[PDB]
Paper text:
Here we identified Vip3Cb1 and Vip3Cc1, the first Vip3 proteins with broad lepidopteran activity discovered outside of Bt from Paenibacillus strains in the P. popilliae-containing clade, most closely linked to P. dendritiformis. Vip3 proteins, including Vip3Cb1 and Vip3Cc1, are highly conserved in Domains (D) I and II involved in pore formation, with divergence in DIII, IV, and V known to be involved in receptor binding to the gut of the insect host. Vip3Cb1 protoxin and trypsin-processed Vip3Cb1 toxin structures were determined using Cryo-EM, resulting in density maps with an estimated resolution of 2.6 Å and 3.0 Å, respectively. Therefore, structural comparisons of Vip3Cb1 to other Vip3 proteins, including commercial Vip3Aa, are consistent with other results, such as amino acid homology, that all Vip3 proteins share the same mechanism of action, even though these originated from a Paenibacillus strain and not from Bt.
Each dimer pair (monomers A/B, or monomers C/D) is conformationally distinct, with equivalency between monomers A and C and monomers B and D. Domains I (DI) (residues 1–192) and II (residues 202–329) are α-helical, whereas DIII (residues 330–533), DIV (residues 534–675), and DV (residues 676–797) are composed of β-sheets, with homology to carbohydrate binding motifs connected by extended loops. DI of each monomer is composed of two twisted α-helices (α2 and N-terminal α3) connected by a five amino acid loop, allowing α2 to fold back to interact with α3. In the tetramer, DI folds into what could resemble the nose of a spaceship, with the monomers arranged in an A-B-D-C configuration. DII forms the spaceship main body (α1, C-terminal α3, α4-α9), containing a central helix (α8) surrounded by other helices, preceded by the tryptic site (Lysine195) for protoxin activation; however, this site had poor density for modeling (residues 195–202). DIII (β1-β14) forms the spaceship base, ending with a helix (α11) that interacts with DII. From DIII, a linker extends, interacting with N-terminal residues, before starting the extended fins of the spaceship, DIV (β15-β24) and DV (β15-β34). Comparisons of available Vip3 structures, determined by either X-ray protein crystallography, Vip3B2160 (45) or Cryo-EM Vip3Aa16 (43) and Vip3Bc1 (44), revealed that the Vip3Cb1 protoxin has an overall similar quaternary “spaceship” structure with α-helical DI-DIII forming the body and β-sheet DIV-V forming the fins. Activation of the Bt Vip3A protoxin occurs by cleavage between domains DI and DII. The Vip3Cb1 N-terminus has the signature Vip3A signal peptide “ALPSF” motif.
Residue numbers in the entry:
A (entry chain A): 14 to 194, 202 to 653
B (entry chain B), D (entry chain D): 30 to 173
C (entry chain B), E (entry chain D): 222 to 269
F (entry chain C): 126 to 173
């Protein structure tokens, strides 16, 4: 759906509780798996010995004369011994049947646990990426003092937890693959997983539960000797400047989410391993909730109020812009507010401004999330062969106002920008249209002048100018240094209020990561990853879908001869509207926009050769109300 | 020290804690049946008036059955020793130990609250200076 | 269990770090005392 | 991978390494003497013409002596299995493993010398800047 | 032996620290590479 | 062994006293950066 909605720490904990309830639903009986195996081996040894004795008695009773009374007595003794042997064999067969019905239930439970754990972990992929970016951008050469204060006590527990989780996932995947591709072979397949379960569930000193508890202890800082790992990690992240997406609040929240979800996955692994061995079911819901609540309370009361909700652009790109008039209007419809921006410079610089409705306590509604794309954003911020004067001001609005429209106007190299903010009333989430304020630089006199000096192009901001999650902004500004010719888009988010009212008090949370995919594009299945492609159709078998002949591992459309791929997109093509056509191609392709009846090429490439993949972006216009126009590759 | 003396008061004479197989229910009847069969076979052998080779092979199978019965009886005796003369004593010792430990820990309850209050005061108002007043060498042992 | 990570080993290590039997005598008791005696802490009772 | 396949080639069918008690010398003669005595007693019992109670008590003591002999024979059989069908195979596997490991490590001998030379160059001329280019999180695992 | 201090655990930890699967991605390979590539080292062979 | 070990250890009593005096006189309030670089890898082996 192009939107990666994050349900919060509370949502992750609720999912873990659901998986716990699913695990507890599988009844394994009243005997531990180890006890069952011990009983099985004991009965097997006894049955083997009794079978040997009975065979010897039978072979010595059917050979000699054995008289009459002696034969009867030996027959009675053999009957009694065979009755004992049959009782032992019945017990052994009962054990075998119990094992043969216990193993499939365990395998099904493990498969369900793996599926639901993967579904939950899909949420934190974006947060892991953000933490990795922060780590890469971290200035560790001079911050080794702090980075050796946070990761000096949490490191052992973190390593143990990560190793246990990864090994459990790997073993569960291996068992699932083996089952997809009876009791004895199942035990031979699950022996390694059972050994891991014994290792992690061993109620001993320095156990997995020990490291799980010490992880929380180090994060909170219960002991007087140590220091809270969360607080020192927040100090490490927030100090200096980390030029990444989101503000300090978002970065520290992402770090907290990573640690919390690691703990939740560790508790899930512990519960699954306890159920796998058939041990007693102890619900870790209370202790997991206590740990997560303590960590969230520490973050809320000792970290969050001191953080800054100010986020700037991730990086800069040195470009030479243009001159003459250039007007952009990031207007949002009534009831909407701007939640983030993105400047992308791959082929043609573009500006994506995200607008959405609000759902109380500064919550961005994913249902109404939309974007506005402006082309040639480099021509607005940078000059070509003259001097550009910027009239910059921190367009800060009072708390409770949400910015709706941001306007940039570059006229005679005079970049003047204004913003409008409407009243929000967070108690009901209704953006009032009558009550608004305007912060404008259209009437300023002081400016900052930058000369292009040919090759010395200006550093246009580049990246996602947004919080770690989309949120309304109450302050927007453009900063110009005039020394290194660097332009910075700096905004202030409302993430703190939504975190305080939704996730840090254990309520429903709906956080939207800034999309890395154009969500307003009309090409259904823009990147071919979804199976059974309905929009994409092939005229024949000449052209197909290569599962590895694309970007990274993208299933790119491969065309060989007369074959072509068609996709009807005439319904969503608005008349008299400008469009951007962008595609990454390899070889000598050709892209057309046919109109079904009376086939004409509104747009056509018909050339372009490249031994490697390159991105081509062009402009297009539809004029005479097509209502029927299909893309052909 | 008093609790140590109480712990040392428990006899546990030449006994070591083992694993209760939880198989007493089946092992008891198995041992009874095997004992009956072995007794009947022993009576048959002792009655005499049998062929020498037949008597010898009956003696051999009786010896093997007695080996099986002896193994079963040894396992059952270990289970009974664990469940009758060892576990009750250990449970009584644990009850007394936890009672006296709770009685002693009742003394350190106000001081634990004072330490918790001091910790709650420290983390609310502090800075990197607290980093200079922290020990890491003691954290593993203390946590353990 | 008796090994290099035994519980008794951790007890002895805890005692040694408390009394200051480290490489450079960093006693945990003195460090914790100087941490507690900061005037920022406002709780009942004297430093003693 | 080839050495892994060679290791997996060793059968070790349903056998687990145990502790060789090193008591084979005494246990062999003890087992022989006990076997002789048990055989003589079994022959005496099987000859018949004995009192029923006397025959029954002789059978009981013969069963107990057979239990002792069976325990001794089981211990001796475990020792023989360790020393005859398990240890030679494990020693051959270890010989092959160490030969192939030495052959593979002969490849990494120039590179070890290069790393040693780099280390000898680093510690001679360096300062606290090297502190900024050191990792402590990997030292325990690497040393282990 | 399978436990929290197993040899396989140390192997996995060594691999993770090498590739940089830490809390803050401090890859040991990159740190060691930037340590080796210092011009103060005068030994045969290029940095590669 | 105990007698001869005590006889040998009698020699290093003065050196232990000197090291203790150095540790007491050490300005650890601002030298925690270095003191956490030396006693961070040697500490486990030293304790054992």
């Amino acid at each position: 759906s192009f939107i990666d909605v994050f349900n919060g720490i509370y949502g992750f904990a609720t999912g873990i509780q659901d998986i716990f309830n699913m695990i507890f639903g599988t009844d394994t009986g009243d005997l531990t798996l180890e006890e069952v195996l011990k009983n099985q081996e004991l009965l097997y040894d006894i049955s083997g010995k009794l079978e040997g004795i009975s065979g010897d008695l039978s072979e010595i009773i059917a050979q000699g004369n054995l008289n009459t009374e002696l034969a009867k007595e030996l027959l009675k003794i053999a009957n009694e011994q065979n009755n004992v042997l049959t009782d032992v064999n019945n017990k052994l067969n009962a054990i075998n049947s119990m094992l043969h019905i216990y193993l499939p239930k365990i395998t099904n439970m493990l498969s369900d646990v793996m599926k639901q754990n993967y579904a939950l972990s899909l949420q934190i992929e974006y947060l892991s990426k953000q933490l990795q970016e922060i780590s890469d951008k971290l200035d560790v050469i001079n911050l080794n003092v702090l980075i050796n204060c946070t990761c000096t006590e949490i490191t052992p527990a973190y390593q143990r937890i990560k190793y246990v989780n990864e090994k459990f996932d790997e073993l569960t995947l291996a068992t699932e693959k083996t089952l997809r591709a009876i009791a004895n072979d199942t035990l031979e397949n699950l022996t390694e997983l059972t050994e891991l379960a014994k290792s992690v569930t061993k109620n001993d000193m320095d156990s997995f539960e020990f490291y799980l508890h010490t992880f929380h202890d180090v994060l909170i800082g219960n002991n007087l000797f140590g220091r809270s790992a969360l607080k020192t990690a927040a100090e490490l992240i927030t100090k200096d400047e980390i030029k990444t997406s989101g503000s300090e609040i978002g970065k520290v929240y992402s770090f907290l989410i990573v640690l919390t979800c690691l703990q939740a996955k560790a508790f899930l692994t512990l519960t699954a391993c306890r159920k796998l061995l058939g041990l007693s079911d102890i619900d870790y819901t209370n202790i997991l909730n206590q740990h997560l609540n303590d960590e969230k309370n520490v973050f809320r009361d000792n970290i969050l109020p001191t953080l800054s909700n100010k986020f700037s652009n991730p990086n800069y790109v040195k470009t030479i812009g243009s001159d003459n008039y250039a007007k952009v209007i990031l207007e949002a419809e009534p009831g909407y507010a701007l939640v983030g921006f993105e400047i992308i410079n791959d082929r043609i610089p573009v500006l994506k401004a995200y607008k959405a409705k609000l759902k109380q306590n500064y919550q961005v509604d994913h249902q109404s999330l939309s974007e506005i794309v402006y082309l040639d954003i480099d021509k607005l911020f940078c000059p070509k062969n003259s001097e550009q004067k910027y009239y910059t001001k921190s367009l800060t609005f009072p708390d409770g106002y949400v910015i709706t429209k941001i306007t940039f106007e570059k006229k005679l190299n005079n970049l003047r920008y204004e913003a409008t903010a409407n009243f929000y009333d967070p108690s009901t989430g209704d953006i009032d249209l009558n009550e608004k304020q305007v912060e404008s630089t259209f009437l300023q006199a002081d400016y900052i002048s930058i000369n292009v000096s040919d090759d010395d192009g200006v550093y246009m901001p580049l990246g996602v100018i947004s919080e770690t999650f989309l949120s309304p902004i109450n302050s927007f500004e453009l900063e110009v240094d005039e020394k290194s010719k660097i332009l910075t888009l700096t905004c202030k988010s409302y993430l703190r209020e939504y975190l305080l009212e939704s996730d840090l008090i254990n309520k429903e949370t709906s956080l939207i990561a800034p999309p890395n995919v154009f969500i307003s594009n009309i090409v259904e299945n823009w990147n071919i990853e979804a199976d059974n492609l309905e929009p994409w159709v092939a005229n024949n078998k000449n052209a197909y879908v290569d599962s590895t002949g694309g970007i990274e591992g993208s299933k790119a459309l491969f065309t060989q001869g007369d074959g072509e791929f068609s996709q009807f997109i005439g319904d969503k093509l608005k008349p008299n509207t400008d469009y951007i056509i962008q595609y990454t191609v390899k070889g000598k392709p050709a892209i057309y926009l046919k109109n079904k009846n009376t086939g004409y090429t509104m747009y056509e490439d018909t050339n372009g050769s490249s031994e490697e993949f390159q991105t081509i972006a062009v402009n297009y216009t539809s004029e005479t109300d097509p209502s029927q126009t299909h893309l052909v590759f």
